[PDB]
């Protein structure tokens, strides 16, 4: 409510990368 949103550092971005890649890898069990 006070700004455009807390920022995401390199470590946070690596975690987001991993989360999306884990979803992609799980898709390989069905496609």
């Amino acid at each position: 409510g006070t700004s455009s949103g807390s920022a995401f550092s390199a470590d946070d971005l690596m975690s987001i990368d991993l989360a999306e890649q884990m979803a992609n890898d799980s898709d390989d069990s069905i496609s």
Binding site: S4, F8, D12, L13, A19, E20
Partner: protein, 120 residues
């Protein structure tokens, strides 16, 4: 009402209940890139469900062309078909949009719908 187009309460359902099976219709309010030298950009989105906004939405990298070719842009209305919620080391949670469909272009909507308040 224009808010009749949006899935009011979907943000609270995602945040409070962790419901990942809904397919809510949301409005993009703003898009901001997050850049790094060797990495593709990561697009962060301020989204609205007509009741709340939330600034911690993140676009899956495979959907970057939608932003780069301007189909996904501020004011457009989209239906989220697949998303996941990820918790960061500091306790913040981000909502990663994996699959979506742009239902109405920014130029066909024209403005922010309603008067949503920030969820956090």
């Amino acid at each position: 009402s224009m808010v009749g187009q949006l899935s009011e309460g979907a943000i609270a359902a995602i945040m409070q209940k962790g419901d990942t099976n809904i397919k809510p219709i949301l409005q993009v309010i703003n898009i901001r890139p997050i850049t790094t030298g060797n990495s593709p950009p990561r697009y962060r989105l301020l989204m609205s469900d007509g009741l709340n906004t939330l600034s911690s939405f993140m676009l899956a990298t495979q959907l970057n062309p939608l932003v780069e070719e301007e189909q996904l842009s501020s004011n457009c209305v989209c239906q989220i078909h697949r998303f996941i919620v990820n918790t960061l080391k500091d306790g913040r949670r981000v909502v990663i949009l994996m699959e979506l469909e742009v239902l109405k272009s920014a130029e066909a909507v024209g403005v922010k719908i309603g008067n949503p308040v920030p969820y956090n």
